[PDB]
Design a protein around this ligand. Structure first.
Ligand SMILES: Cn1cc(N)c(C(=O)NC2CCC2)n1
Ligand SMILES: Cn1cc(N)c(C(=O)NC2CCC2)n1
Lengths: 265, 264
């Protein structure tokens, strides 16, 4: 991969691997989620990062995902090359936004797009805070000045308020635990695991006859290595829509909430 | 990736990804296991396959892993390029063997090696079958004639008989279930999940102070999508462990193995 000519975005090509595909022989949404994560890491490394700035490590501050939104028009097949372009943008003192565009390397058409909202948090106390002026200027040089939105639309699906699932849920997957493969280099559960865990409550019949089009996920609390999750789902709707909820098995503390949209094959 | 000049092996370079590494910022043994699996698929595709031969698809026959053995000297770091060379060989009518050599793309040194024993099963009845001729000949053109062994040594770790763990186990991880990410394109639990599941019973204190050097795993039975596994471990000794994966209910054995760890 490499930065574009202006140095205000990064591109990377990935060949889809055999273990990265599902039953339809196309990449899973978790493979896509992993690829977006990977290109974001390479973008951060290519501009002198490790993505904590000078003032962030001084104050023990980290970026945390608050929301992920992914829309896929076509899933790349096993053996195909997918090109992903990623960039970041300041959202004032609220946090940062990271966008992605997925393309077929052969045709050059947009086969998917994603958007994420990141908030600043103290690594130790876990307390959210607004972006300071000294920190905002440190990352502003790596961002476009004019708005560059992967989801421009005057009423897009990425900004909708997600309601909380009411008990009883229509479908559920109980007793979900993360293994060492689910943890990142800092021993925290990878953000992509929550996506997989959310989808565990969707019935296998829907997965066999439908393709996942859109997924919106709100990250409320992190699941520890020794925590147990419960995935809950209810159909709300040629298109099926679901409301989702991930919570701790014990106290029932909410850790994630979201919605998915599926279309008939 | 591509086949070598003689067409009797395949090579491929992989850049280690950020989500593929552990706390030491080096690739996990499951990332390595995934890479070996991937290079084996590309090798099979590059020589005209869909590794099912002509006779095999007519008879509803598949290759299944009976044994996996991996030895790592150095784990590639996040950002490093690892080159893997893989090849197949016949072992008479008992089955097939697949070997791998892992190398650092910069220095060219051997940083790891693996060997696997594959047996021929009937997809539907799940019944083991010996490798008859005709199907033996159909694939012997893609294999070296003289023995090419990643583990040559007479009396090496890859050929040792693994005993069955006795109850009670010293360490255990219970209630393990596969998710959709753990399944392959045919909806079967990926062989690499069993490796991860085996390692779930190793205490986090050993993982934090030791590096995994060798792992030998015997595949006895497949775990279904709706099955629940129990991972059991006992220290037998460098630290050495005896492992056992079994179904939560009936306690049916699905996998057994051993791991060797060195102090950091
Ligand atoms: C720690 N980190 C770096 C990233 N680039 C991501 C990231 O984009 N995560 C989302 C969740 C679906 C992919 N997370
Ligand atoms: C379906 N398939 C093709 C392969 N080449 C492998 C394979 O080598 N798997 C082993 C166990 C983890 C490494 N499995």
């Amino acid at each position: 991969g490499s930065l574009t000519e202006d140095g205000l975005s990064y591109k990377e090509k990935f060949v889809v691997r055999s273990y990265e595909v599902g039953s339809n022989k196309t990449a899973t949404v978790e493979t896509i989620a992993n690829l977006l994560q990977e290109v974001g890491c390479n973008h951060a490394q290519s501009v002198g990062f490790s993505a904590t700035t000078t003032t962030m490590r001084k104050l023990h501050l980290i970026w945390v995902t608050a929301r992920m939104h992914i829309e896929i028009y076509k899933y790349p097949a096993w053996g195909d090359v997918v090109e992903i372009e990623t960039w970041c943008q300041s959202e004032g003192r609220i946090g940062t936004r990271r966008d992605w565009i997925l393309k077929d390397s052969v045709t050059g058409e947009v086969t998917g797009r994603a958007t994420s909202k990141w908030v600043m948090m103290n690594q130790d106390t876990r307390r959210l805070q607004k972006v300071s002026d000294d920190v905002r200027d440190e990352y502003l040089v790596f961002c476009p000045q004019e708005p560059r939105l992967a989801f421009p639309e005057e009423n897009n699906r990425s900004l909708k308020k997600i309601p909380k699932l009411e008990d009883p849920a229509q479908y559920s997957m109980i007793g979900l635990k993360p293994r060492r493969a689910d943890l990142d280099m800092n021993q925290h559960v990878n953000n992509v695991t929550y996506i997989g865990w959310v989808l565990e409550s969707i019935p296998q019949e829907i997965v066999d006859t439908h393709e996942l089009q859109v997924i919106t996920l709100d990250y409320r609390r992190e699941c520890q290595q020794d925590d147990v999750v419960d995935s809950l789902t209810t159909t709300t709707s040629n298109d099926s829509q679901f409301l989702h909820l991930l919570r701790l098995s014990g106290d029932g503390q909410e850790i994630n909430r979201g919605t998915t949209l599926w279309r008939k094959k």
